[PDB]
Coordinates of C-alpha atoms in Angstrom, one line a residue:
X1 CA 0.0 -0.1 0.0
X2 CA 1.1 3.7 -0.6
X3 CA -0.1 7.0 1.2
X4 CA 0.7 9.8 -0.6
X5 CA 1.6 13.2 1.1
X6 CA 2.5 11.3 4.4
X7 CA 4.0 12.9 7.1
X8 CA 7.8 13.0 6.6
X9 CA 8.4 10.3 9.2
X10 CA 6.0 7.8 8.0
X11 CA 7.8 8.0 4.5
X12 CA 11.0 7.8 6.5
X13 CA 10.5 4.6 8.0
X14 CA 9.6 2.9 4.6
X15 CA 12.4 4.4 2.7
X16 CA 16.3 3.9 2.1
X17 CA 16.8 7.7 1.7
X18 CA 15.4 11.0 3.5
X19 CA 13.4 13.5 1.2
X20 CA 10.5 11.4 0.2
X21 CA 6.7 12.0 1.1
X22 CA 4.9 8.5 0.2
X23 CA 4.5 6.0 3.1
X24 CA 4.6 2.3 1.6
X25 CA 3.4 -0.4 4.0
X26 CA 2.0 -3.9 3.8
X27 CA -1.8 -3.8 3.7
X28 CA -2.2 -6.1 6.8
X29 CA -1.3 -2.8 8.7
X30 CA -1.1 -4.2 12.4
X31 CA -4.2 -6.0 12.3
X32 CA -4.8 -8.3 15.2
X33 CA -1.9 -6.6 17.2
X34 CA -2.6 -4.1 20.2
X35 CA -0.5 -1.2 21.2
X36 CA -1.1 0.4 24.8
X37 CA -0.2 4.0 24.9
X38 CA 0.9 4.8 28.5
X39 CA 0.7 8.7 28.5
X40 CA -2.0 11.2 29.2
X41 CA -4.8 9.6 27.7
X42 CA -6.1 9.1 24.1
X43 CA -9.1 11.1 22.6
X44 CA -10.6 7.7 21.3
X45 CA -13.4 9.9 19.5
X46 CA -11.0 11.4 17.0
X47 CA -11.9 10.4 13.6
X48 CA -8.5 9.5 13.0
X49 CA -9.0 6.2 15.2
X50 CA -12.0 5.0 13.4
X51 CA -13.2 3.4 16.4
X52 CA -9.9 1.4 17.1
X53 CA -8.9 3.4 20.2
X54 CA -10.2 3.0 23.6
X55 CA -9.3 4.2 27.2
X56 CA -8.7 1.1 29.3
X57 CA -7.3 2.6 32.7
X58 CA -7.0 6.1 34.4
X59 CA -5.2 7.0 37.8
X60 CA -6.9 10.3 37.8
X61 CA -10.5 11.8 37.8
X62 CA -11.0 11.3 34.1
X63 CA -9.7 8.9 31.4
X64 CA -10.0 11.9 29.0
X65 CA -6.6 13.3 27.2
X66 CA -6.9 16.9 28.6
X67 CA -3.3 17.6 27.5
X68 CA -3.0 16.2 24.0
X69 CA 0.4 14.5 24.1
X70 CA -1.0 10.9 24.7
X71 CA -3.4 11.5 21.7
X72 CA -0.6 12.6 19.4
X73 CA 1.5 9.5 20.6
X74 CA -1.3 7.3 19.6
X75 CA -2.0 8.8 16.3
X76 CA 1.6 7.9 15.4
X77 CA 1.3 4.4 16.4
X78 CA -2.3 4.0 14.8
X79 CA -4.2 6.8 13.1
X80 CA -5.4 6.5 9.8
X81 CA -3.5 9.3 8.4
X82 CA -0.6 10.1 10.9
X83 CA 0.2 6.3 11.9
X84 CA 2.5 3.7 11.4
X85 CA 0.2 0.8 12.0
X86 CA -3.2 1.7 10.8
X87 CA -5.2 -1.2 11.7
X88 CA -4.0 -1.9 15.1
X89 CA -6.0 -1.6 18.4
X90 CA -5.1 1.0 20.6
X91 CA -5.5 0.8 24.3
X92 CA -5.0 4.1 26.6
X93 CA -3.6 3.9 30.0
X94 CA -3.5 7.4 31.8
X95 CA -0.5 7.6 34.2
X96 CA 0.1 11.1 33.2
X97 CA -2.1 14.1 34.4
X98 CA -3.5 16.6 32.3
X99 CA -0.3 18.9 32.8
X100 CA 1.8 16.0 31.7
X101 CA 3.3 14.9 34.9
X102 CA 3.0 11.9 37.0
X103 CA 4.4 10.0 39.9
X104 CA 6.7 7.1 39.4
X105 CA 4.3 5.2 41.6
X106 CA 1.4 5.6 39.3
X107 CA 3.5 4.8 36.2
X108 CA 4.9 1.8 37.9
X109 CA 1.3 0.8 38.3
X110 CA 0.6 1.4 35.3
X111 CA 3.0 -0.8 33.7
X112 CA 2.2 -3.7 35.8
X113 CA -1.6 -2.9 34.7
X114 CA -0.7 -3.7 31.0
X115 CA 1.1 -6.7 31.7
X116 CA -2.1 -8.2 33.2
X117 CA -4.4 -6.3 31.2
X118 CA -3.5 -7.9 27.8
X119 CA -4.7 -11.2 29.2
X120 CA -8.1 -9.5 28.9
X121 CA -7.4 -8.3 25.4
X122 CA -7.7 -9.8 21.9
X123 CA -4.2 -9.5 20.2
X124 CA -3.4 -12.7 18.2
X125 CA -0.5 -11.1 16.5
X126 CA 1.0 -9.6 19.7
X127 CA 1.2 -6.8 22.2
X128 CA 3.4 -3.5 22.4
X129 CA 3.6 -0.6 24.8
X130 CA 4.6 2.8 24.0
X131 CA 6.0 4.9 26.9
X132 CA 6.8 8.4 25.7
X133 CA 7.8 9.7 29.3
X134 CA 10.5 9.4 31.6
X135 CA 12.5 11.0 34.6
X136 CA 15.5 10.7 36.5
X137 CA 17.0 7.0 37.1
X138 CA 15.0 4.7 39.4
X139 CA 15.7 1.0 39.6
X140 CA 12.2 0.6 40.5
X141 CA 10.8 2.4 37.2
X142 CA 13.3 0.4 35.4
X143 CA 12.3 -3.0 37.0
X144 CA 8.8 -2.3 36.1
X145 CA 9.5 -1.6 32.3
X146 CA 11.6 -4.9 32.6
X147 CA 8.6 -7.1 34.1
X148 CA 6.4 -5.5 31.4
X149 CA 8.8 -6.8 28.7
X150 CA 9.5 -10.2 30.3
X151 CA 5.7 -10.5 30.2
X152 CA 5.5 -10.9 26.4
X153 CA 5.1 -7.1 25.6
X154 CA 7.2 -5.4 23.3
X155 CA 8.1 -2.1 25.4
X156 CA 9.4 0.8 23.7
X157 CA 10.5 4.0 25.8
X158 CA 11.8 7.4 24.9
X159 CA 15.4 8.2 25.1
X160 CA 14.6 11.6 26.7
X161 CA 15.0 15.3 25.6
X162 CA 18.4 16.1 27.6
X163 CA 20.6 15.7 25.0
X164 CA 22.6 13.7 27.6
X165 CA 23.5 10.0 28.2
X166 CA 20.2 8.2 28.7
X167 CA 21.9 6.3 31.2
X168 CA 20.8 8.6 34.0
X169 CA 17.0 8.4 33.0
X170 CA 14.2 5.9 33.5
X171 CA 12.6 3.8 31.9
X172 CA 15.2 4.9 29.1
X173 CA 18.2 3.3 31.0
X174 CA 16.4 -0.1 31.5
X175 CA 18.8 -2.5 29.0
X176 CA 15.8 -5.0 28.3
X177 CA 13.6 -2.5 26.7
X178 CA 13.7 -0.7 23.4
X179 CA 15.1 2.6 24.0
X180 CA 14.4 5.3 21.2
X181 CA 16.3 8.4 20.3
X182 CA 15.0 11.0 18.0
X183 CA 15.9 12.2 14.5
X184 CA 14.9 14.7 12.0
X185 CA 13.9 15.2 8.2
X186 CA 17.6 15.6 7.2
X187 CA 18.7 12.5 9.0
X188 CA 20.4 14.5 11.9
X189 CA 20.1 13.5 15.4
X190 CA 17.3 15.6 17.0
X191 CA 19.4 18.6 18.8
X192 CA 17.5 17.5 22.1
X193 CA 17.8 13.6 21.8
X194 CA 19.5 11.8 24.5
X195 CA 22.1 9.4 23.3
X196 CA 24.5 6.7 24.9
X197 CA 25.0 3.0 24.8
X198 CA 21.5 2.0 26.2
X199 CA 19.8 3.4 22.9
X200 CA 18.7 0.8 20.6
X201 CA 17.3 2.7 17.6
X202 CA 16.5 6.2 16.4
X203 CA 13.1 7.1 14.9
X204 CA 11.5 10.2 13.4
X205 CA 11.3 12.8 16.2
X206 CA 11.3 16.4 15.1
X207 CA 8.4 18.3 13.4
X208 CA 5.9 15.3 13.8
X209 CA 2.5 15.7 12.6
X210 CA -0.3 13.7 14.4
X211 CA -3.8 14.1 16.1
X212 CA -4.5 16.4 19.1
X213 CA -7.2 16.9 21.2
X214 CA -10.5 18.7 20.0
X215 CA -10.5 16.4 17.0
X216 CA -7.4 18.4 15.8
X217 CA -3.8 17.9 14.7
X218 CA -0.5 19.5 15.3
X219 CA 3.3 18.9 14.6
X220 CA 5.6 18.9 17.5
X221 CA 9.0 17.3 18.5
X222 CA 10.6 15.0 20.9
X223 CA 11.7 11.5 21.6
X224 CA 8.1 10.9 22.6
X225 CA 7.3 11.3 19.0
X226 CA 10.0 9.0 17.7
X227 CA 8.9 6.2 20.2
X228 CA 5.5 5.7 18.9
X229 CA 6.9 5.1 15.3
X230 CA 8.9 2.1 16.7
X231 CA 6.0 0.9 18.7
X232 CA 3.9 1.1 15.7
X233 CA 6.5 -0.4 13.6
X234 CA 6.6 -3.3 16.1
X235 CA 3.0 -4.0 15.8
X236 CA 3.0 -4.1 12.2
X237 CA 6.2 -6.6 12.0
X238 CA 4.3 -8.5 14.3
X239 CA 1.5 -8.7 12.5
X240 CA 3.3 -9.8 9.4
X241 CA 5.1 -12.6 11.3
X242 CA 8.5 -11.4 11.1
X243 CA 9.4 -11.0 14.7
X244 CA 7.8 -11.1 18.1
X245 CA 7.4 -9.1 21.2
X246 CA 10.7 -10.7 22.8
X247 CA 12.7 -10.1 19.7
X248 CA 11.3 -7.0 18.0
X249 CA 13.7 -4.5 19.1
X250 CA 16.7 -6.8 18.1
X251 CA 14.8 -7.3 14.8
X252 CA 14.3 -3.6 14.2
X253 CA 17.9 -2.9 14.7
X254 CA 19.2 -5.7 12.4
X255 CA 16.9 -4.5 9.6
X256 CA 17.4 -0.5 10.4
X257 CA 19.1 1.8 8.0
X258 CA 22.6 1.8 9.3
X259 CA 25.2 4.6 9.5
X260 CA 22.9 7.3 7.7
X261 CA 22.5 9.6 10.7
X262 CA 24.4 12.6 11.4
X263 CA 25.9 13.8 14.8
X264 CA 25.8 10.3 16.8
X265 CA 28.2 10.3 19.2
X266 CA 31.0 7.7 19.2
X267 CA 29.5 4.6 20.9
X268 CA 25.8 5.1 20.0
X269 CA 24.0 3.2 17.8
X270 CA 23.7 4.7 14.0
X271 CA 20.1 2.6 13.3
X272 CA 17.0 4.4 12.1
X273 CA 14.0 2.3 12.0
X274 CA 12.9 0.9 8.8
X275 CA 10.1 -1.3 8.0
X276 CA 12.1 -2.9 4.7
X277 CA 8.9 -3.1 2.8
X278 CA 9.0 -3.9 -0.8
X279 CA 5.9 -2.7 -2.5

């Protein structure tokens, strides 16, 4: 399948070169997979989600996304226009308040929730969790992400926006999950993107168009935007049967575009997420 005039990041993940604007992908499109977006919520009523999104858990007075961040990330995973995996099922877990903030204890509870809750959902092609959030190093936060991954969920986490080594941030620093840095449309490391040995992969993160609350759209930047590209890619590849939740981060790294990014510090992987789809 071909989506013309796609957001640059979608075009980038199906291309061997920057500078194109059509997204190419197998029509299976993540059907039969599920992606949890652990964030500020999801405006599931947005036409872009086509009934495929739902809120399943909140730790606050509403499950609504009063911020926009979670809706944007969910749109990059799986919205019809802005999403990588256009037929996946999206499940929102609201661990962040409407200011985008949240206590680590709530974030940990949300991860353990997903590990159990997947047993209440129909995801025959597999389960992914996208975590566009983080703070300072916490062994307890890392352990929760490790448990979620161990339970059979492909966990993708944002590297962080400090232009620093991600070793000092959580869950970015957990070795067993997929830690995602950000790139721009000219294949430069995004100026804010964290780096370091703990990164597994880069995805598009500067000037990413996606869904927003109020049935709208906007373009914003962050490793929060790169992470759902990778989460959606994992769901897409699992539906295709090319990999599994336990193996998807390694498979994505194996099949990535290699050596094409600029300003990658020595010792950080130079790997850009790529679906290797041949129309």
